[PDB]
């Protein structure tokens, strides 16, 4: 309703952080995905190499994994919680995770009520 479609991403990731339910990168994500112990994948457009996007989309399409699409690399990494922040709490040192996967969610009604409905 009032909340933006992409706002759920941050809430979901920051709530799934505590449970360690966030498979990071590709050589952890793919091997977790190949056991079918994963719910959702998040992929960035800024992907210079071709084979990366076709591999991840094919593997995610294989076992009927739903997809959320993010613009750039650094923001996704900041939303999952990779970046190191200063004393004031601004992002100083950033690292990009182009593909992220989730196995377990937390308990957030404001997050759960919209994110699944994007696939209706």
């Amino acid at each position: 309703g009032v909340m933006d479609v992409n706002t759920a991403l941050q809430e979901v990731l920051k709530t799934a952080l505590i449970h360690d339910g966030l498979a990071r990168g590709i050589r952890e994500a793919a091997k977790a995905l190949d056991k079918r112990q994963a719910h959702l994948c998040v992929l960035a457009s800024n992907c210079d190499e071709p084979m990366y996007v076709k591999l991840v989309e094919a593997l995610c399409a294989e076992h009927q994994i739903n997809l959320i699409k993010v613009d750039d690399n650094k923001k996704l990494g900041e939303w999952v919680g990779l970046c190191k922040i200063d004393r004031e709490g601004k992002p100083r040192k950033v690292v990009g995770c182009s593909c992220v996967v989730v196995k377990d969610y937390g308990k957030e009604s404001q997050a759960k009520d919209v994110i699944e409905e994007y696939f209706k």
Binding site: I26, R27, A30, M51, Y52, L55, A58, L59, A61, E62
Partner: peptide
């Protein structure tokens, strides 16, 4: 560099 791309060979119509 990017070692897990050698594990899979995905075709155009999707044979993983």
């Amino acid at each position: 560099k990017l070692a897990v791309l050698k594990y899979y060979k995905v075709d155009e119509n999707g044979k993983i």
